[PDB]
Amino acid sequence: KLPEAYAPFSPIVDVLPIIPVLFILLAFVWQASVSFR
Amino acid sequence: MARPNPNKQVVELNRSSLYWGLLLIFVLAVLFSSYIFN
Amino acid sequence: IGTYQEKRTWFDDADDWLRQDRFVFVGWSGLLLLPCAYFAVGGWLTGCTFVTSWYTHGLASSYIEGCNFLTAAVSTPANSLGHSLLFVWGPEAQGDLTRWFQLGGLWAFVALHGAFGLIGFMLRQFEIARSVNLRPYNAIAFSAPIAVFVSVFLIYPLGQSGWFFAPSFGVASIFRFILFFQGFHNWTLNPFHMMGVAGVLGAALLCAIHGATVENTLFEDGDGANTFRAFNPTQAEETYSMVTANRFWSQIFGVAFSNKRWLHFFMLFVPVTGLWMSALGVVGLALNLRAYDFVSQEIRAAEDPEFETFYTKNILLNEGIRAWMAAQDQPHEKLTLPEEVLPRGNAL
Amino acid sequence: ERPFSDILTSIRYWVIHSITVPSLFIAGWLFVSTGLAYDVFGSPRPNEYFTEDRQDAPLITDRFNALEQVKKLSAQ
Amino acid sequence: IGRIPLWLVGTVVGLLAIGLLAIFFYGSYVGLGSSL
Amino acid sequence: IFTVRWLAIHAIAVPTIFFLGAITAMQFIQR
Amino acid sequence: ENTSLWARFCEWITSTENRLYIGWFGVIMIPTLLTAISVYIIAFIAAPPVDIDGIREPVSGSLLYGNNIITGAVVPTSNAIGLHFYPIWEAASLDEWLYNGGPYQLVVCHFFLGVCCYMGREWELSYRLGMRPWIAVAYSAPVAAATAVFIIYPIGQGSFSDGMPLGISGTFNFMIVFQAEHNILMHPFHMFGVAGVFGGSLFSAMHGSLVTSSLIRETTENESANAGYKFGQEEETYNIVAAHGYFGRLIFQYASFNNSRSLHFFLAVWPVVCIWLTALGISTMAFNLNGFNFNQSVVDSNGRVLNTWADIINRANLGMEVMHERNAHNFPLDLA
Amino acid sequence: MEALVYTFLLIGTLGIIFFSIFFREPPRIA
Amino acid sequence: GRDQETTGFAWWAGNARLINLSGKLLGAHVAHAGLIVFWAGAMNLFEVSHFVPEKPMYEQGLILLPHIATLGYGVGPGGEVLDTFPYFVSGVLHLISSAVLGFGGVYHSLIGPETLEESYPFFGYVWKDKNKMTNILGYHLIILGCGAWLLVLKALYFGGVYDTWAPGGGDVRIISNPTTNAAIIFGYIVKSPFGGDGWIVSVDNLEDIIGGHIWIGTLCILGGIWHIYTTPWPWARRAFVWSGEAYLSYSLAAVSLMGFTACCFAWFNNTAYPSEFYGPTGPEASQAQAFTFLVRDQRLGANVASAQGPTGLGKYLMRSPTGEIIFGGETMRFWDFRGPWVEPLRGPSGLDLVKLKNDIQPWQERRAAEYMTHAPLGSLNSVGGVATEINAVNFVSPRSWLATSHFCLGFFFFVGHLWHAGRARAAAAGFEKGIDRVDEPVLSMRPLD
Ligand code: CLA
Ligand code: CLA
Ligand code: CLA
Ligand code: CLA
Ligand code: CLA
Ligand SMILES: CCCCCCCCCCCCCCCC(=O)OC[C@H](COP(=O)(O)OC[C@@H](O)CO)OC(=O)CCCCCCCCCCCCCCC
Ligand SMILES: CC1=C(/C=C/C(C)=C/C=C/C(C)=C/C=C/C=C(C)/C=C/C=C(C)/C=C/C2=C(C)CCCC2(C)C)C(C)(C)CCC1
Ligand SMILES: CC1=C(/C=C/C(C)=C\C=C/C(C)=C/C=C/C=C(C)/C=C/C=C(C)/C=C/C2=C(C)CCCC2(C)C)C(C)(C)CCC1
Ligand SMILES: CC1=C(/C=C/C(C)=C\C=CC(/C)=C/C=C/C=C(C)/C=C/C=C(C)/C=C/C2=C(C)CCCC2(C)C)C(C)(C)CCC1
Ligand code: OEX
Ligand SMILES: [Cl-]
Ligand SMILES: [Cl-]
Ligand SMILES: [Fe+2]
Ligand code: NA
């Protein structure tokens, strides 16, 4: 388990793996926003 | 409309179609010889 | 119609309305293809989410029970039903829809509407090819998938005991159908199936080869590093160097294409011929007329206890399919087999 | 012409959709949750797969009396 | 016309679709078909 | 509008949206 | 000025004037595949029965020992040796080499070198002729499938006896036991590959139909309608627009394949990436990643198992499990 | 003669493909 | 960024536009490194948050907690975890380094210098200056040599690294006098890749591991110095293509070969990849099954030396292709298995029948049975073991994961090497865009026939 001083922070920890998948999708968002010029 | 036939046509078999037909016959042969021999 | 007066009737008004440029074209086949296809896809989608198969197959093949996209299937009716068209108004349902379901009627609904939708889709291709005034080689090609559909979903259950032995509209039920032909029919050993496999593999080979060769011999046609912006439909010149492609494949493979027409007709011919050969083989298996065994090898195996080959092994694995799988796949036949008479070897 | 590049970008398309699409969504939700899908399409409940008289998978094994057979073999 | 960006429309549609597939994949481990 | 495109896209849209709402309900159903 | 021997040698190797381009990848082309093909022909004709499973049960596999070409197969290497690299010189005798499945390792290793060098030779001719070189990248999918079925699956399962037999009925046996031990049919990579060959057939038929349909009158019912003009002219007037118009009017007019370059790129990449996916699926199966096992997943409110198509597939899978390699087992559960 | 006829057929296929590679018609029209 | 008409590169090739913008290129690189350490730290934190201590650590689907635990941080004399604070601090440091690296990447991607020669000649570079490219390569080689020597220092003087071959069942062993024999190390690198030798995966002791690490760090430092103080030779210039595309292709080939090597390591290695942390390999969980049924059936009173199974070969014991005594089951292919719980059971003759009859320790018994139950099967949707088996256990082997994923990545990276190698050659030659259409090379030579 996570240490005692950090135990209630396991919810914000638990979502952190998917952020790199959100990064390439954010690149696609920016390309849509610039309309794929 | 006369004695000779104006609808006469001659047959043409080029070497590519020759090779394709020979390959077809021998592939059918290798496929079905094992089954007719049984 | 040959500079005649051609007095206008309701037919000409209807033809003028049907042959119009819209988002989606309707035409005459829209009288058939649109309702038949929409009903087919809607029936399959509805049966894959709500319509259970507990009554007919004794199993769950719908999302409402605990099945996934790779598990749900619009299942066939029971074998005791034979080959009924299984109408909602027939002697089976007697006009009742909520019990027309869970009895295999939706399978027959989807199959018949899909067959007529395929008919309407070839009519679609024909009449659009008429409107654009082009040859219907697309319909010529499409004659093979519907031959496969007829030989698989109609001819095979019609020749066998009933719709129960037809493939159910799904994914894992199709896989069951595949393993069913593997064990019960030895469909791999059938020469027509070998032709079908060769046709599909060669068609994918032609697809990859043609795409790669055209896309790697596509000239410069500009200054930008992106090749796709260099294509222009206004110019009449060819996009790719066919002489360069022919030289490349002649020096790599040994033989190469010289004619675009013969290339594209080969790409047309190979899958159509393979699929028709597979359709003929399934027509053969519709009558239980199998290429199951080799007489010389089975006699040699019977009179020689130390002569074994992969064919003998395949026969044994087919017996594994039948003995361990028919008992649950055929609940109507009531296989209460003890599991000490099933063929099961060491440990496993 | 409406090439779909102008319908989506206008809020007039979304004001007539901000309630109709969620309306269809909640309609499907209530349709499944009230048991109406089970009632209309013949699926048994998870608690009504087997009756008390039979504890094995059901078989039709009949054609002209199959309607009354599925009536007796289904959940009351 | 142009009151909302087409890219923002596609992005919110993609978010809704990805979340839809996500809750579909989540519902495979619980409830019906959970194998437990 | 009620044109041919409208009818086609609505015949594909309305029951698919109904089925998605249905299945999102189906995901939270437990035995 | 090419008056030295190895300069003339590099000139003849590099030259495109030979009937078949050899190249610097060709110097590993020619001997490796002639070695593999020679051993394949001689083994398929007159090989003694090969002990595949290591339990002194040899598979005949060769025509002169009493089987046809449908059931004849160059049998994989023995289970006793495993993937231990056993060539002729490691064998005390040619008879021992043939009994332990040495020709299988010979042909498979030489075929692997041959396919990699055929990849390189395709790139090499692409370089000497000045085209784009990604034809080898497109051919990287069937070779990936070949390596996955021939060496990678034996590496994952521990022994070359696990590999594909070099034949037809042996191919069927390998495929069936593959389904039995891995549930390949219910794997998304295998579904992607099946969709890829189905779409390859579909798109090949569609492209052939759309090109052969979009033609102008130049070849009549006779051999050629050249009365307007014979051969020796550069007039390109086949068709440019009507095929795309037909494809647009087919369904919804927004599936834009007007760009023939984009059409051919998609036509190449779809089956290639799908065969990449199924080849990687087979390589993952080598490390026992298996398929979707939704068996006994449907249960009622009482927890009782409700059967399904996946359960039927599971029953067939265990039916092939309890029959393959008839007397190879000693211990209950099957571990590689 | 069981294996010999398959031998004839296989040699015929190899000879046909060898002749198609080497003794082929030259590629005309581009 | 820029658009397509000024670069000739579409959106789906946008990173190609950075082929000449070195400042934006290094910014993308450092943001990428920040992404890598972000995944590392986030996975460490999530994996500690989802950690069960009493359950053995390879059963939670854990891939890089074994990476720290192999180094000997927070683990006892039996593979017991005891504490997870070293894992926690490693994850937090990786997360903070990710924050600072991503800040640098974002800064150089947006308002970094567009080009570097006009402001920083030490960082300014083209793709043609061989001396400058070798200088950069030398700097990176020195960094990698220091990184390998850091592991050497840890294994030598820092009280780390978990020896699975330590007596009793593995322990955190301080490695003293590592074997730096050049003959031994070169014999490891030039031996056969097959099952007889194993090439690079068959390393079996920390002495050889740290000796090879000493060798690699030493040559990496010296090669960094060499490339800094030299310039490529004319034969290297004539044999290589010198552009940024070609360099990428060479790196892609090398990293694809590395990925295949790592796949084979994760599947077969048992020394650098401890079975206590990763579960059984390929050979074990089958050799474990053989040994466990061997000891069970000798406990029931049968004669395992008798054996003589279904095919007349032996249900428990057999002679290998060489005269050593091996297991007689279907695991007669894995007889080259060397594991911690068979080597005291194994001697020059074979499996030591007398040691099989008498000397079997209960820890070996428990380890073998546990490795039987947690076999490296597992299916991709979790579920149990064999594809024919059912929903009984939730376990997929991390060795299977680290093999399958890394083979997939290595194969795509081989394909990417091929793509970029062909494109670099065609770009240096000039016909990357296509055929010039006014002088095609086909009409420059005589026809074949
Ligand atoms: C117009 C498109 C179309 C087509 C081609 C079909 C075709 C088909 N449907 Mg279907 N159906 C449709 C639309 C269509 N349907 C619609 C819109 C609905 C929703 C209400 C349905 C609902 C439906 C159900 C519930 C079922 C079918 C079924 C069937 C199949 C068998 C029908 C049958 O045998 O009964 C007979 C049909 C006919 C004889 C056609 C009638 C044409 C007659 C001859 C015209 C007579 C008019 C005449 C001029 C009257 C004036 C004369 C008077 C003044 C003297 C069949 C392939 C069944 C099935 O699939 O089997 C499982 C079935 O269960 N359909
Ligand atoms: C590892 C992924 C990655 C990275 C690091 C980059 C990096 C970069 N790309 Mg890019 N790209 C990628 C993937 C990536 N790309 C993919 C997958 C595609 C295909 C869709 C593209 C296609 C592409 C194109 C077409 C172009 C680039 C361009 C660029 C460069 C400048 C972008 C710019 O200035 O506009 C500004 C961008 C933004 C303002 C949006 C990004 C917002 C920030 C930077 C990211 C999110 C904030 C971040 C989380 C804050 C961190 C906090 C910190 C304290 C830790 C830049 C160095 C451009 C170029 O070529 O340079 C001239 C350009 O034309 N890329
Ligand atoms: C001497 C100059 C120098 C040094 C020291 C470095 C160092 C580094 N560069 Mg860099 N680079 C340089 C010049 C230099 N570069 C130049 C001139 C360019 C062209 C503009 C680049 C372009 C460049 C790019 C594009 C990238 C790097 C990256 C990296 C890092 C990769 C190693 C890593 O993170 O893995 C792990 C490191 C270790 C395991 C080693 C542990 C640390 C040891 C113990 C300290 C070494 C002490 C040593 C004696 C001091 C260095 C001496 C020096 C003279 C070499 C690394 C710290 C990559 C990066 O961004 O990573 C963040 C990367 O993407 N560099
Ligand atoms: C989806 C992207 C992805 C992800 C999530 C991973 C994830 C992982 N990879 Mg991987 N990889 C990828 C892509 C990816 N890879 C690709 C595309 C390739 C090319 C095909 C590779 C090739 C590859 C190889 C060759 C290897 C991995 C390995 C690994 C595992 C350990 C990573 C590691 O420590 O490496 C190394 C990290 C560094 C080099 C950073 C330098 C810092 C050093 C290590 C510091 C020294 C530590 C020191 C001892 C600390 C002591 C403290 C001291 C102060 C006392 C890990 C789970 C390893 C593995 O487990 O094999 C199965 C491994 O060998 N990967
Ligand atoms: C670290 C390695 C590396 C690097 C630095 C590059 C760099 C580059 N590549 Mg390249 N490539 C690589 C590896 C690499 N590649 C590999 C391994 C492959 C084989 C798959 C390719 C295949 C490839 C092609 C076909 C092309 C490039 C191109 C390019 C250039 C433009 C990239 C771009 O902006 O596209 C934009 C990036 C995207 C649109 C995102 C792509 C998303 C992919 C296709 C889907 C997979 C994502 C998914 C999460 C992964 C699933 C898991 C996986 C294991 C399957 C650029 C300089 C282009 C080029 O040649 O220009 C010179 C080009 O057309 N690459
Ligand atoms: C070192 C190189 C290694 C390769 C050597 C072995 C490759 C064999 C050559 C391929 C087959 C040649 C096809 C002849 C047919 C032939 O050459 O016809 C000639 C034909 C040329 O046609 P054209 O382009 O001239 O068409 C226009 C005409 O109308 C005008 O002439 O070539 C082709 O059809 C395309 C090639 C497709 C090749 C299809 C492969 C067929 C599979 C063969 C399987 C053999 C049996 C298995 C063994 C038992
Ligand atoms: C750490 C460690 C170790 C060590 C290891 C080692 C020692 C390694 C190495 C290694 C090495 C020492 C390597 C090397 C290498 C190299 C390479 C791999 C190369 C290459 C190249 C190529 C491939 C080429 C190509 C070409 C040609 C063909 C000719 C012309 C030019 C060109 C470029 C084109 C050991 C295991 C002991 C222990 C554990 C850990
Ligand atoms: C049966 C029946 C009928 C019919 C009906 C119909 C015809 C309808 C329908 C319907 C429909 C028609 C439905 C549907 C469904 C659908 C769905 C359920 C979908 C989906 C899902 C998903 C999940 C997706 C995803 C995705 C993808 C993958 C692709 C792209 C992207 C996205 C994301 C979208 C009636 C009543 C008449 C009567 C008789 C019986
Ligand atoms: C340029 C560009 C790009 C890229 C971008 C990037 C790549 C960014 C990044 C970045 C990064 C790479 C970031 C990272 C980060 C990290 C952070 C920001 C952190 C932190 C911190 C904290 C606050 C923590 C806390 C804690 C602890 C200490 C332990 C326990 C748990 C917790 C969580 C509580 C894109 C593609 C979009 C597009 C194109 C352009
Ligand atoms: O050899 Mn072909 O399949 Ca691989 O797991 Mn163990 O070994 Mn046999 O059984 Mn299952
Ligand atoms: Cl078998
Ligand atoms: Cl065994
Ligand atoms: Fe074309
Ligand atoms: Na057995």
DSSP string covering C76-124 = ---GGGTT----TTSTTTTT-STTTTTTTHHHHHHHHHHHHHHHHHHHH
Q: Is I171 helix (H, G, I), strand (E, B) or coil?
A: strand
Contact residues, G window 30-49, toward C, CB-based 8 Å cutoff? none
For the residues of I363-416, what is the DSSP string, one character each?
HHHHHHHHHHHT-S---TTS--SSTTS-SS-----HHHHHHHHHHHHHHHHHHH
User: What is the Cα E36 distance to its own chain's centre?
Assistant: 25
For the residues of C270-312, what is the DSSP string, one character each?
HHHHHHHHHHHHHHHHHTT------HHHHHHHHS-TT-B-HHH
b/e burial code for range G108-144 (CB count within 10 A of at least 16 → b)? bbbbbbbbbbbbbbbbbbbbbbbbbbbbbbbbbbbbb
Q: Which CATH number is D4-73's, of 2.40.30.30, 3.40.50.150, 1.20.5.860, 3.40.50.1110?
A: 1.20.5.860
Which technique? cryo-EM
For residue G152, give the DSSP letter: I
Q: Is G51 helix (H, G, I), strand (E, B) or coil?
A: strand
In the block, tokens 């005269």 appear at I323
Which residue in D49, D51, D55, D59 has the most chain G C-beta atoms within 10 A of its own C-beta, making it the best mutation to test that interface?
D49
How would you class C54 by CB atoms within 10 Å of its CB: exposed for 0-12, middle for 13-18, buried for 19 or more? buried
Task: Answer whether I123 contacts ligand 3 (Cβ < 6 A).
Answer: yes
- Residue G294 tokens read as 């939704």
Angle (CA) C8 C14 C18, round 5°: 135
| I45/G277 Cα distance (integer angstroms) | 32
In this complex, the residue of I196, I403, I419 whose CB is nearest that of residue G137 is I419
Touching chains F and H? (3+ Cβ pairs < 8 A)? no
Which residue in C247, C250, C252 has the most chain I C-beta atoms within 10 A of its own C-beta, making it the best mutation to test that interface?
C247
- H30 min Cα distance to partner chain C (Å): 5
| Residue I405 amino acid letter | S
- Residue I226 tokens read as 């060499």
| C328/C127 Cα distance (integer angstroms) | 47
For residue C61, give the DSSP letter: -
Hey, how many other C-beta atoms are within 10 angstroms of the C-beta on C345? 17
Q: Name every residue whose Cβ is closer than 8 Å to that of residue I51 and which is 6 or more positions away in sequence.
A: A1, I57, I60, I62, I65, I81, I84
Sign of the four-CA dihedral C101, C107, C110, C116: negative
User: What is the Cα G294 distance to its own chain's centre?
Assistant: 29
- Residue G143 tokens read as 């070779």
In the block, tokens 């679609």 appear at C124
In the block, tokens 């730290």 appear at I41
Task: Answer whether G181 contacts ligand 10 (Cβ < 6 A).
Answer: yes
Is G121 in contact with G25 (CB distance < 8 Å)? Answer: yes
Is G296 in contact with I384 (CB distance < 8 Å)? Answer: no
Pairing of strands C169-170, G50-51: unpaired
Sign of the four-CA dihedral E5, E9, E12, E14: negative
Hey, how many other C-beta atoms are within 10 angstroms of the C-beta on C190? 24
Q: Which run of H or of E encompasses C225?
A: none
Angle (CA) C10 C14 C17, round 5°: 140
CA distances from C68 to C63, G248, I228 (A): 6, 34, 60
Task: Answer whether I8 contacts ligand 2 (Cβ < 6 A).
Answer: no
Contact with chain D for residue G56, Cβ under 8 A: no
Pick the closest to residue I434 from G316, G86, C214, C115 (CA basis): C214
| I363/G141 Cα distance (integer angstroms) | 47
Is C220 in contact with I436 (CB distance < 8 Å)? Answer: yes
- Residue H12 tokens read as 């015929």
Angle (CA) D34 D36 D37, round 5°: 115
- B34 min Cα distance to partner chain H (Å): 8
**Partners of G308 in the beta sheet?**
C60
| G327/C343 Cα distance (integer angstroms) | 12
| Residue C219 amino acid letter | F
Helix extents (H) in I158-278: 182-190, 206-228, 234-239, 246-268, 275-278
Is G291 in contact with G186 (CB distance < 8 Å)? Answer: yes
Hey, how many other C-beta atoms are within 10 angstroms of the C-beta on H15? 12
Check H29 against G231: CB less than 8 A apart.
Answer: yes
Is I389 in contact with G293 (CB distance < 8 Å)? Answer: yes
| I245/C49 Cα distance (integer angstroms) | 51
| Residue G301 amino acid letter | S
- For the domain made up of G5-186, give the CATH fold: Photosynthetic Reaction Center, subunit M; domain 1 (1.20.85)
User: Could you identify the atom of ligand 7 that is nearest to the CA of residue I239?
Assistant: 31
Angle (CA) I72 I74 I76, round 5°: 80
Instruction: Provide the residues around ligand 12 (an ion) whose CB is within 5 A.
Output: G 330-331; I 329-330
Sheet strands (E) in chain G? 50-51, 58-59, 73-74, 166-167
Residue of I nearest to G162 (CA): I333
Q: Is I326 helix (H, G, I), strand (E, B) or coil?
A: strand
| H24/D1 Cα distance (integer angstroms) | 56
How would you class E22 by CB atoms within 10 Å of its CB: exposed for 0-12, middle for 13-18, buried for 19 or more? exposed
Q: Name every residue whose Cβ is closer than 8 Å to that of residue I134 and which is 6 or more positions away in sequence.
A: I227, I228, I230, I231, I232
Using alpha carbons only, how large is chain B's radius of gyration in Å? Answer: 18
Dihedral pair phi/psi, residue G326, rounded to 5°: -45, -50
Is C61 in contact with C53 (CB distance < 8 Å)? Answer: yes
Contact with chain B for residue H2, Cβ under 8 A: yes
User: Atom 7, ligand 10: which residue's CA is nearest?
Assistant: G336
Check D47 against G301: CB less than 8 A apart.
Answer: yes
| I302/I227 Cα distance (integer angstroms) | 67
Contact residues, E window 11-30, toward F, CB-based 8 Å cutoff? 20, 23-24, 26-27, 30
| I127/C324 Cα distance (integer angstroms) | 65
Check F29 against E32: CB less than 8 A apart.
Answer: yes
In this complex, the residue of A1, A17, A31 whose CB is nearest that of residue I46 is A17
Is I292 in contact with I371 (CB distance < 8 Å)? Answer: no
In the block, tokens 């694995």 appear at C317
CA distances from F18 to C61, D8, G103, I198 (A): 20, 21, 61, 58
Check D47 against G306: CB less than 8 A apart.
Answer: no
Q: Which residues of G touch H (CB under 8 A)?
A: 19-20, 45, 63-64, 66, 68-69, 231
- Residue A16 tokens read as 């952190």
For residue I305, give the DSSP letter: T
| G47/G72 Cα distance (integer angstroms) | 11
Task: Answer whether I93 contacts ligand 9 (Cβ < 6 A).
Answer: no
Touching chains E and D? (3+ Cβ pairs < 8 A)? yes
| F16/F6 Cα distance (integer angstroms) | 15
- Residue B17 tokens read as 């179609």
Interchain CB contacts (distance < 8 Å): C and E:
11
- Return the axis-axis angle of helices F4-26 and D20-33, rounded to nearest 10°: 40
Q: Is D12 annotated as a binding residue?
A: yes
Phi-psi region of C7 (alpha: psi -120 to 50; beta: other; left: phi over 0): beta
Pick the closest to residue I290 from I250, I331, I325 (CA basis): I331
| C223/C234 Cα distance (integer angstroms) | 18
In the block, tokens 């099954």 appear at I289
User: Atom 5, ligand 2: which residue's CA is nearest?
Assistant: I28
- C45 min Cα distance to partner chain F (Å): 9
User: Could you identify the atom of ligand 1 that is nearest to the CA of residue C90?
Assistant: 64
User: What is the Cα I204 distance to its own chain's centre?
Assistant: 16
Is C46 in contact with C62 (CB distance < 8 Å)? Answer: no
Of I205, I216, I240, I264, the one to substitute when testing ligand 7's pocket (max ligand atoms within 8 A of C-beta) is I216
* Upper half-sphere CA count for residue G316 (Cβ side, 13 Å): 30
| Residue E29 amino acid letter | Y
